[PDB]
Design a protein around this motif. Sequence first.
Motif, PDB file in Angstrom:
ATOM      1  N   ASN A  78     -11.111 -11.421  17.460  1.00 23.08           N
ATOM      2  CA  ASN A  78     -11.215 -11.407  16.004  1.00 23.08           C
ATOM      3  C   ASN A  78     -11.465  -9.986  15.496  1.00 23.08           C
ATOM      4  N   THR A  79     -10.375  -9.216  15.451  1.00 23.02           N
ATOM      5  CA  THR A  79     -10.351  -7.827  14.999  1.00 23.02           C
ATOM      6  C   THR A  79     -11.151  -7.608  13.725  1.00 23.02           C
ATOM      7  N   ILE A  80     -11.089  -8.575  12.810  1.00 25.55           N
ATOM      8  CA  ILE A  80     -11.911  -8.519  11.609  1.00 25.55           C
ATOM      9  C   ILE A  80     -13.382  -8.398  11.976  1.00 25.55           C
TER      10      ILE A  80
ATOM     11  N   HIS B 264      -1.967  -7.542   6.040  1.00 27.92           N
ATOM     12  CA  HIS B 264      -2.151  -8.067   4.691  1.00 27.92           C
ATOM     13  C   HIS B 264      -3.319  -9.041   4.612  1.00 27.92           C
ATOM     14  N   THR B 265      -3.548  -9.805   5.679  1.00 26.08           N
ATOM     15  CA  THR B 265      -4.648 -10.760   5.661  1.00 26.08           C
ATOM     16  C   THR B 265      -5.991 -10.056   5.835  1.00 26.08           C
ATOM     17  N   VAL B 266      -6.054  -9.061   6.722  1.00 28.11           N
ATOM     18  CA  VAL B 266      -7.336  -8.432   7.014  1.00 28.11           C
ATOM     19  C   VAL B 266      -7.798  -7.575   5.844  1.00 28.11           C
ATOM     20  N   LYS B 267      -6.867  -6.922   5.153  1.00 29.53           N
ATOM     21  CA  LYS B 267      -7.239  -6.133   3.985  1.00 29.53           C
ATOM     22  C   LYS B 267      -7.852  -7.020   2.908  1.00 29.53           C
ATOM     23  N   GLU B 268      -7.096  -8.016   2.447  1.00 27.85           N
ATOM     24  CA  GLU B 268      -7.574  -8.892   1.385  1.00 27.85           C
ATOM     25  C   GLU B 268      -8.771  -9.730   1.804  1.00 27.85           C
ATOM     26  N   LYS B 269      -9.041  -9.852   3.097  1.00 27.73           N
ATOM     27  CA  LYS B 269     -10.329 -10.351   3.546  1.00 27.73           C
ATOM     28  C   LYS B 269     -11.337  -9.230   3.743  1.00 27.73           C
ATOM     29  N   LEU B 270     -10.937  -7.981   3.519  1.00 23.55           N
ATOM     30  CA  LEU B 270     -11.857  -6.858   3.598  1.00 23.55           C
ATOM     31  C   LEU B 270     -12.477  -6.499   2.256  1.00 23.55           C
ATOM     32  N   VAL B 271     -11.959  -7.034   1.150  1.00 17.71           N
ATOM     33  CA  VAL B 271     -12.571  -6.775  -0.146  1.00 17.71           C
ATOM     34  C   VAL B 271     -13.848  -7.565  -0.353  1.00 17.71           C
TER      35      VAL B 271
ATOM     36  N   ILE C 298     -15.048  -3.579   0.160  1.00 13.39           N
ATOM     37  CA  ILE C 298     -14.524  -2.570   1.069  1.00 13.39           C
ATOM     38  C   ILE C 298     -13.014  -2.524   0.900  1.00 13.39           C
ATOM     39  N   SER C 299     -12.503  -1.353   0.551  1.00 14.28           N
ATOM     40  CA  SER C 299     -11.100  -1.155   0.236  1.00 14.28           C
ATOM     41  C   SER C 299     -10.446  -0.290   1.303  1.00 14.28           C
ATOM     42  N   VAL C 300      -9.148  -0.049   1.131  1.00 16.01           N
ATOM     43  CA  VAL C 300      -8.358   0.614   2.157  1.00 16.01           C
ATOM     44  C   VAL C 300      -7.144   1.247   1.503  1.00 16.01           C
ATOM     45  N   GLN C 301      -6.679   2.347   2.086  1.00 17.81           N
ATOM     46  CA  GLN C 301      -5.472   3.033   1.655  1.00 17.81           C
ATOM     47  C   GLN C 301      -4.570   3.171   2.865  1.00 17.81           C
ATOM     48  N   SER C 302      -3.424   2.514   2.833  1.00 17.12           N
ATOM     49  CA  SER C 302      -2.467   2.635   3.917  1.00 17.12           C
ATOM     50  C   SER C 302      -1.540   3.808   3.643  1.00 17.12           C
ATOM     51  N   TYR C 303      -0.925   4.319   4.703  1.00 14.68           N
ATOM     52  CA  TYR C 303      -0.100   5.510   4.593  1.00 14.68           C
ATOM     53  C   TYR C 303       1.192   5.315   5.371  1.00 14.68           C
ATOM     54  N   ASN C 304       2.100   6.276   5.216  1.00 16.85           N
ATOM     55  CA  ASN C 304       3.409   6.274   5.867  1.00 16.85           C
ATOM     56  C   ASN C 304       3.485   7.463   6.817  1.00 16.85           C
ATOM     57  N   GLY C 305       3.414   7.200   8.118  1.00 21.37           N
ATOM     58  CA  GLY C 305       3.455   8.290   9.069  1.00 21.37           C
ATOM     59  C   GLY C 305       4.480   8.181  10.181  1.00 21.37           C
ATOM     60  N   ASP C 306       5.561   7.424   9.977  1.00 20.33           N
ATOM     61  CA  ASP C 306       6.561   7.312  11.032  1.00 20.33           C
ATOM     62  C   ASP C 306       8.004   7.244  10.541  1.00 20.33           C
ATOM     63  N   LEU C 307       8.265   7.377   9.246  1.00 22.76           N
ATOM     64  CA  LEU C 307       9.621   7.276   8.731  1.00 22.76           C
ATOM     65  C   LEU C 307       9.913   8.417   7.771  1.00 22.76           C
ATOM     66  N   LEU C 308      11.203   8.627   7.520  1.00 22.01           N
ATOM     67  CA  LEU C 308      11.619   9.624   6.543  1.00 22.01           C
ATOM     68  C   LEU C 308      11.517   9.070   5.132  1.00 22.01           C
ATOM     69  N   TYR C 309      12.267   8.016   4.850  1.00 25.15           N
ATOM     70  CA  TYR C 309      12.272   7.377   3.548  1.00 25.15           C
ATOM     71  C   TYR C 309      11.534   6.050   3.628  1.00 25.15           C
ATOM     72  N   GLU C 310      10.923   5.661   2.516  1.00 24.90           N
ATOM     73  CA  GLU C 310      10.267   4.369   2.467  1.00 24.90           C
ATOM     74  C   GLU C 310      11.294   3.257   2.653  1.00 24.90           C
TER      75      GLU C 310
END
Lengths: 462, 460, 460, 456
Positions: free
Chosen positions: A77-79, A109-116, A120-132
Motif C-alpha cells: 500500500n504505497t499510499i 490519479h487515485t493516490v493524488k486525490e486521496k492525498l488531499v 497535501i498537494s502535488v505538482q507533476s512534471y514532464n521529464g521524458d518527452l519532447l511534446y506533451e
Amino acid sequence: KKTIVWFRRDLRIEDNPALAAAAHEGSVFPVFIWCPEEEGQFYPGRASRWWMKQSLAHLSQSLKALGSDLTLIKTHNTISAILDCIRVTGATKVVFNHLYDPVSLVRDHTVKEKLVERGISVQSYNGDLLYEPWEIYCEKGKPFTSFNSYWKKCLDMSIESVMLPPPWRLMPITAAAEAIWACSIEELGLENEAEKPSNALLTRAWSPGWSNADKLLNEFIEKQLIDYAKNSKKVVGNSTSLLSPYLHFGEISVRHVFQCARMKQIIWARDKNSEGEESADLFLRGIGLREYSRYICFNFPFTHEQSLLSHLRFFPWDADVDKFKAWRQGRTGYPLVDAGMRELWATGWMHNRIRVIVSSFAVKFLLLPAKWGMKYFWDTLLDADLECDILGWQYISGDNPALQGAKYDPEGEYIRQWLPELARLPTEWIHHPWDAPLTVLKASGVELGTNYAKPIVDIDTA
Amino acid sequence: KKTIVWFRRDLRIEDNPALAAAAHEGSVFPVFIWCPEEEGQFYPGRASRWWMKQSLAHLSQSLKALGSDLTLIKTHNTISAILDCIRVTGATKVVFNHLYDPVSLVRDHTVKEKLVERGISVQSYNGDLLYEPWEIYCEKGKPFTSFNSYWKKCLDMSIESVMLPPPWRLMPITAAAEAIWACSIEELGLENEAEKPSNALLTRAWSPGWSNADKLLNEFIEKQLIDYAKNSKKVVGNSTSLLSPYLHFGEISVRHVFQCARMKQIIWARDKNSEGEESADLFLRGIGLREYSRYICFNFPFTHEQSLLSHLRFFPWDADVDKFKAWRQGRTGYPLVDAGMRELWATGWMHNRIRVIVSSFAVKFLLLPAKWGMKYFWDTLLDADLECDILGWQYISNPALQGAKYDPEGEYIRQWLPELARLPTEWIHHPWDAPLTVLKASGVELGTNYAKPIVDIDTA
Amino acid sequence: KKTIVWFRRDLRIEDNPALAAAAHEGSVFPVFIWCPEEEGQFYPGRASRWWMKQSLAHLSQSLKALGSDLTLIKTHNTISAILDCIRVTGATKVVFNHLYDPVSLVRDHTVKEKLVERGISVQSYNGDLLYEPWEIYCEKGKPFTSFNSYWKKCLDMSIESVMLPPPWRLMPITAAAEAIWACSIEELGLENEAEKPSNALLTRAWSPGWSNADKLLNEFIEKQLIDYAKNSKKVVGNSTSLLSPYLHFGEISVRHVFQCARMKQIIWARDKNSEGEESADLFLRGIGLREYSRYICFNFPFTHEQSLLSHLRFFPWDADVDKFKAWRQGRTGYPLVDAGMRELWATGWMHNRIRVIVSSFAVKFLLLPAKWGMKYFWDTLLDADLECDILGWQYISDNPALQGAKYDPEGEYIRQWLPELARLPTEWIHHPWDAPLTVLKASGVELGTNYAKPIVDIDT
Amino acid sequence: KKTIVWFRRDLRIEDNPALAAAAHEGSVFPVFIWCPEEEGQFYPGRASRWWMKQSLAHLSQSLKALGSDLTLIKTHNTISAILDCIRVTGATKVVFNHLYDPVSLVRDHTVKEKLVERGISVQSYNGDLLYEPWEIYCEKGKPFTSFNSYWKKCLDMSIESVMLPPPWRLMPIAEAIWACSIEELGLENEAEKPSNALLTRAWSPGWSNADKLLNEFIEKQLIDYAKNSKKVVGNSTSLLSPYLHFGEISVRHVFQCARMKQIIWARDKNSEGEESADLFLRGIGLREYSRYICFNFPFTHEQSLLSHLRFFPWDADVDKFKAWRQGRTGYPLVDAGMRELWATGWMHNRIRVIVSSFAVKFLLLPAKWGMKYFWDTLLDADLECDILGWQYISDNPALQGAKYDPEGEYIRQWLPELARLPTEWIHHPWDAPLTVLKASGVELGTNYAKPIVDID
Ligand SMILES: Cc1cc2nc3c(=O)[nH]c(=O)nc-3n(C[C@H](O)[C@H](O)[C@H](O)COP(=O)(O)OP(=O)(O)OC[C@H]3O[C@@H](n4cnc5c(N)ncnc54)[C@H](O)[C@@H]3O)c2cc1C
Ligand SMILES: Cc1cc2nc3c(=O)[nH]c(=O)nc-3n(C[C@H](O)[C@H](O)[C@H](O)COP(=O)(O)OP(=O)(O)OC[C@H]3O[C@@H](n4cnc5c(N)ncnc54)[C@H](O)[C@@H]3O)c2cc1C
Ligand SMILES: Cc1cc2nc3c(=O)[nH]c(=O)nc-3n(C[C@H](O)[C@H](O)[C@H](O)COP(=O)(O)OP(=O)(O)OC[C@H]3O[C@@H](n4cnc5c(N)ncnc54)[C@H](O)[C@@H]3O)c2cc1C
C-alpha cells in the motif's frame, strides 16, 4: 521547507524537471517504491527486472556525492508508506515525473486525490518527452492517424519546455526510524537467487547507469552519426545507436539527445555536406516514432484497453507447444529466423529490422499465439517497453526469405557470426540452403539432420 | 508578431536567450550596428578589429542556413538608425543582451527612453553572466570586496538562468528598402589596405567563428581538462584553455561552458579521482574571476578618478619614446620579457603569467606611464576586454627566481629567441652576469648579436 | 686464433664484416686508438668530437652484453701503440676496415709493411662502401670523368659484396693492466671542460647510437620514403631523411640501407606506383653522389693537390676579417642566409639546398677566402667528413628573389627561426630591402634597428 | 650462360640462394614441374592444394617486373620434361633447393644420377634451414635424443650462412613439351571452387605479404609472446606457419630480426621481453628438430608408422568418426575445434593437441584414420611436422580448460548456443545441477547434443 521526491523511471541527475524543482524549496529525501500487488499482468520481464537491479546501485551512489541518499522501500500500500514518511519527516509536496502506461495513470490519479485528505498537494512534471501527449491537435481538436503528417506537425512547432541545469548540491534530510519495512536492494525481489550469476553475463556488451549513457552519447555522434544513413539497413556490427535500454528507463534525457544531435544537423547543412545531413533526418525521425507510440496510447486507449485492439485476439493459432518451443530455441530451420534468437538470448538485443523478420515469421508462418510470443519478448528483451512493443505487434499484423536477406545482409557476414556451423557455404544462396542443389551442400560441411537442424516447415505450404 | 533583435557581442546562436525569446512571438529581423565615433577613445584596437571582421562573415552564413540574413549599419546615431529601421517593418520589440561597459550603459538607458517615450516595447535579457551582479547581497544591500568571499557565496546559490535550445525555422519579414544603408562588411570600415596584408597572417594560429568554438570545447574537456591543475603554471606552448577571445565576443555561451564542465566534475568526485577533482575546481574558479570583474564595474561604482581608479594618477615618472621604442621591439635585454613581446607581435596572444611579467617590468623597472601601457595591449591583444584589463593592472598596482616556477627547463626562450640556442638554464635566464668564458663558448657576444639589459636590475 | 679488431669509423655491431670474419677464428677484444698528433690540421672539429664521445659510450654497453670490453688507448704513434697490445695479448692476426682519406692511406700503408717484419698476418675488410674505387674503370681501363656517366655504369655490377649477421657470444681475453700513457676517455679528452655544459643542448634534436639508427631507418623507410620526391626541395620541417651523421661514422651500414630500399622499390615496381617508384629513385642517387665522392678522392689526385684546386690562391680575396665574424653570427641581412646560420649553430645540421646558398655567399657575394669557409663548416657540422666536404666547395667554384619561392613557397622557414619577420607578407620576406616604407612601418619591422640592414648591395 | 633454376617449395625471390647464384652468371629461365601421379598418397589435400593456387599467381606477377617469365609445366614424368626443356633452350645448369621428405628425397638424387650423362653440372643449395643436418654431427657422429640437447649445441656453435642480397637484373632467354595453362594444372575440382571462397577471409597468400606479418609481428607483439602463447583466446600467436611452409619467407631472415630485437632488449634490461624472445625462437627451433630426425632416420625409421599401431585394436566404426568433423562430441572444447578448423583451416597448437589426443584416447579411432583427414583440411599439411606431433602424443576437460580459457569467451564466440552459463561450468555441462539448466537456455539432447562418451 520539506518535500518528497518520488522516483519511477528518471534515474538521472541532469535535466530532471521533477528533481530540479525540489532543490529550490528545501531539503528532500527521495523514495523508490516497489509494489507487485497492483501490476496485475503487467509485472516486469525477466531481464528488465535485472536492469533496475543494476542502475540503482549506480544511481544511489550518485546521491552520496550530492549529499543525500536514495532510500528504497517495498510495500503493498504505497499510499501508506507515503502516509508513513509523511508522518516521519513532515514534508508537504511530493513531486514526481509523469508516466503514460495505463497501469500507472490509474495509480497516480487515485493516490493524488486521496492525498488531499491531509491537505497535501502535488505538482507533476514532464521529464521524458519532447511534446506533451495533449498538445498536438488537428484543426478541429482531433487525433492524427498518419505518423508522417504527425511528424511534420511536431517538426515545425519548435516549442520545448526547458533543458534545466544540474543542481549544485542537495539539502539532506537527517534520518528516521526503521518502521518503513525495507532498507536494502536484496530484500527487493528483483532477481531470484537460483539465477543470480546465470543472469549476469550480459555485463560484457552492456553497462547500465547514466554515467555510461553520457560516454555512449558523446562517443556516438562524433564517430558514427555521419554513417547512420548508410548503416541503418546493415544488421551486422554495432551499426546503430544502441540507446534503446537507456531511454526506456530514463537514464539519458531524450530532450537532450534532441539538442546535442540537432546542433550537428545544422553544421553540415551550413557546409552543404548533404551526405551527413541526410543521415540526421532518419535519426531524429527515429525518436519521433517513439512519440507516435505514446501519443496514440493516450489519445486512443491502449489496444482498445482489452486483450488486443479489434481483430487479433481469437485467431486460431495452432495450439501446439514444441514449435513455440522451437521458435525460441533457435532450431526452426532457417538461417535468418534462427540467427538472432541465438543472439537474443546472448545479449538481449536485436537489430530493429531483424525483429520484424523474426516477428512476422511466427504468427504468419508458424501460426503460434502472439500472446505466447509477445510475453516471451517482454520476458527477455532488455528495453521491453509496454507501449511501443504493442505498437510493434500491430505493424507486424498488417515474405520470400531469399530476396530480403541480400539487401539486409549483402555479403553473408551476419549469419557467419551467429551460425558458425554454416561457415563454409558460398555467399550465394546461403540464406536458403534448402533451395540449392544437393551436391553443392556436400561440397560444404552442411548436412541437414544430425549436424544441422532441418527446416521445421517450408514456404511451399506456408 | 514582429521583432528586431540587435546583436552587440553575442555572435552565437546556441543558447542566445535574447534570440530564442523573439522566435516565439512571430518573426524576426537581425541587425548589427557599428559605432565609429561614439566610442571616442574606446574605438576597438587594431587586431581586435580584425577578429570582428572574421567573426561576422562566418556568422552571416550561419543565420543564412536558418533562413535569414544579417544587416549591417554604420552610424554614430544608433537611436537614429534604429529609429529608421523600425519604420521598415513596424515591430513593437527590440531585444538585445545586457552589457556593462561604461559607454554602452549610457547608450542603453537612452535607447529604451527614446523607445519607451516614443512607445515601442522592448525587452532585455541576460546571456553573458551566470549570476547578475545585482543579485548577490552581503547582509541587506551592501557588496562584498574579497573575491574569495564573493566566490564562496556564488557556489551556494544555484538559482540561475535556463539554457534554451536553438530554434528550427526562422522567418525574416521583408527587408524592403535599403534606405537604412545596408552596408557591407568590406564596405564597413574595419581595417586599412596598407596594413591589411600583414594582419591576415594571424590565421596561422587562430580561426574565428562560433562553429569553431564548439569543435574546440569538446576538443578541450575530453582531452586535457583532467590535468589543467598541473599545466597552468607551465608557460611553454599550448597548455591553457585558449578560450579567452571566444568568451569575450559571445562566441560560446558561458553557462553551457558551466554545464559540460561540471558534469565532468561530479563524475570524478564519485570515483575518488582526487587529482581531477582538484583540476576541475581550478577552472570553474577560473571563470569566477570573469564575473568578479563585472561585479566591480557596475555594482561597485566606476572609476571616480581616471580610468585607473584610485592608485596611479600622479606618478608616470617618464615621457620617453626610445625606451617605449625599445620595450615593444623585443630589444629589452631581459631574455624573458623579450620572449613575450615577439610572441604577442607574432600571434596576438600571451599566457596569463607573461601578461603579469611584461607589465611589472614595464612600470616597476622601465619607468613608463600606465596609460601608455593599457592602450598597446588595447590595440593588439585579440581578447582585449576592458573590464578584464583594469583588473589586469590593479593586480600589479630578479627573474631567475620567477624563472623557475613558470618555465624550469628553459624550453620557452629557445623558441622565440633562437640566438640563445647554446646556453644552459643556469645562465639562460640572465645572460648579463654569467661567467665570461661561458658566453664566448656559446654563440652570444653581448651587444653584437644581443643587446645588454636596458636597466640594471641590481640597483633600480 | 687470437686477433685484435680495430675500430676507426664503423662503430656498429650489425654487419661489421671486419668483425664477423674474426667471429670464426677465436677470441677478440675491440680497440679504439686515439692520437691527436698525426692529423695536425685534420683534427676533427668541436661538434664533431662530441659525436664520438656520445657514440662510443653507447657502443661499449652493447658489446658488454656479449662478453667483451672495448679498450681505449692514447699514443703519439699508433705503430708503437699497437705493438704494446702485442706485448700482453700476443695475438696472431689483425683485422680492420678500409678508409680513403689522405691521412690514413699513408699511415696504414706503413702498418702492413711494418708488421710483416714481426711475422704477423694482417688482413683488411671493406665494409663501408658499395663498390671498390679501383674496380670501376672505363672501357679502356681509364677512370670515368663525370657522375651521370658513372652512375648508369654502376647499376649493372656483378661481383657484389656480402651481407653478414651479428655473432652471438664473443670469447674475450683479459691480458693485463690497461695500457701505457692513457686511460678511458679522460686523458684523450674528446671535449674540453668548460665547453661541456653548452654542448648538451644538442641532444634535444639528435640521439647518437646505432641502436637509435635502426629505429630511425625502419621509421624512415616504411613511413616517409614514399614521399621523398615531394620533400627533397622543401626546406621547412624534417623533409630529408636526416641520416647524414650516422652514415659518416658508420653507425649504420651503407650496404644495409641500400638493400632495404631496393627490396622496397620492387614492391611498388609491381603495382605501377611510379610516383612512389620515382621518389625511391632519388634516394638511390643520393647514395650515388656520396660514393662518387670517395671515387675521385682515391683514383684522382689527392685533394686535387691543394685546398684550392691546385693553387687557386691568386684571384681576388680581399680578406676583410670583419665580415667573417659578422657573417657567422647570422647578421648578414639576407633572410635566407641568416636563416641558415641560426640553424647551423643550434642543431649542427642544415638542408643541403641551404648549404649551397651560404657556400655561394661567403665567396661570391662577399669575396672571402674559401679556406675561411671550410674552417667554420668543419668546426660545427655534425657530419664534417673530409671527402664529400671538399666536393661541396668544389661544385660551386643566382638571385634570392626567385629561389625563395623555389625552396620555401609560403615562407615558413624564415618565420620559424627569425621570428621578428613574423609580420611581413610572404611575398616580401625573402627580400625586405626592396620593400616600400608603407609596409615596413605598417608591420613591426624597421630595417636598421632590430633587424640588421643589408651588409652589402646585391649588385656588388 | 643460361641456367635453369627449379622452383619446388621456395616460391620467393628474396633471399633465394638457388636463384641469385645464377645472377653472377647471366640469363636464367625458371620452370615449375607438377605431377599428380608420382606422389602416390602424399597428393596434397584440399587445403594445401588451394594455397598453391594463389602463390604461383603471386610469384609469376612478381618476377615479371624483373623482366622475366615463369612457365607452368605439368608432366606424367618429372625427369623427362627437364631434358626436354634442355634441348629447347640448351642450358648448362639446373639449380634447385632441397626438400628433406623421403617421398621426394630420392627423386632429386635420381636426377643428379642422370644429368652427369649429358655433362651439365648441378648445384643444390640450402634454402630452408639454419643447420643443414650434416654438420651438427656431435660426439663423432651420434645424433641427440631430446630437442633441448639438439637445440643447445647449435647455439654455442652458432655459425650460419650469409644472407644473400636480392637480384637486380633477370635478362631471360615452342612448347616446353605439351605446355599447360594454370587451370589444367588442377589444384581444385569443379565442385569445391566456390566453397574455397570464404577461406580468403582468414588468409592472403603471396611472399609480398609475409614481410608485413613479419615486421608487424616483431615490433608490435613479440614482447607479449611469452605471456600470450598459452592463451587460446584471440590472436595471441604469430600465425606464420603457412607462410613459412611454402618457402614464401626465408626462415633464416626471420631468425635474424628476431635475434636483433632480442639483444636490443638486453641493453635496456627489459628482462620481461628477453624471455618473450628466447621462447619465440624456440618456436622456430623445434621445427628444425623435425627435419633433424627425418634425415638421420627416415620418418618412423621406415614408413608412415614406426612399427607399433597395427595391434591395439580400434573402435571400427564411422558413425563415431562421422560425429567428429560434425562437431557433436559433447565437450564444447572439442566441438569448438572442428567448427573452427572446418571454417578457417587453422587451429592453435594447444587446442590441436586436445583435439588430436581425443580421437585415440577417448573416441578410440584408428590413429592414422584421423591423421589423414588433417592432411585434407589443415592449411599447413607437412609430413615432417604432422608426424612429429602425432608422435608427440603417443587430463580433464575442466582441469586443462582452465589454463587456456579463463572466461570461456572463446567458447561463447564459436558456440553461440551456450552463451549463458557461468565460466566455471561451460567446459562440462553435465555437472551443472538441474536448477542452473532450465534457467539457462540449454537442455542436452535437444538444444545441444548429449556427450557421446562415458567420461571415465
Ligand atoms: C595586464 C593584464 C591584462 C589583461 N587583459 C586581459 C584582457 O583584455 N582580456 C582577457 O580576457 N584577459 C585579460 N587578462 C587576463 C588573462 O590574459 C586571461 O584571463 C587569460 O590569460 C587568457 O588565457 P586562457 O583563455 O587560456 O585562460 P584560462 O584560465 O585557461 O581559461 C579561459 C578563461 O579564464 C578566465 N580567466 C583566467 N584568469 C583570469 C583573470 N585574471 N581575469 C579574468 N578572467 C580570467 C577568462 O575569463 C577566460 O574565460 C589580463 C591580464 C593582465 C595581467
Ligand atoms: C657545399 C657543400 C658542403 C657539404 N659538406 C658536407 C659535409 O661536411 N659533410 C657531409 O656529410 N655532407 C656534406 N655535404 C653533402 C650534403 O649537403 C649533406 O650530406 C647533407 O646532409 C645532405 O642531406 P641529408 O644527408 O640529410 O639527406 P639524406 O636524405 O638524409 O641523406 C641522403 C644520403 O645521400 C648522401 N648524399 C646526398 N646528397 C649528397 C651529396 N650532394 N654529396 C654527398 N653525399 C650526398 C648523404 O650523405 C646521405 O647518406 C655538402 C654539400 C655541399 C653542397
Ligand atoms: C600433432 C601436431 C601436428 C602438427 N602438424 C603440423 C603440420 O602439419 N604443419 C604445420 O605447419 N604445423 C604443424 N604443427 C605445428 C602447430 O600446429 C603450429 O604451431 C600451428 O599450427 C601454427 O601456429 P603458429 O605458426 O602461429 O605458431 P608460432 O609459434 O606462432 O609459429 C612459430 C613457428 O614455429 C613452428 N612451430 C610452432 N609451434 C610448433 C609446434 N608445436 N611444433 C612444430 N613446429 C612448431 C612453425 O613453423 C611456426 O610457424 C603441428 C603440431 C602438432 C602438435
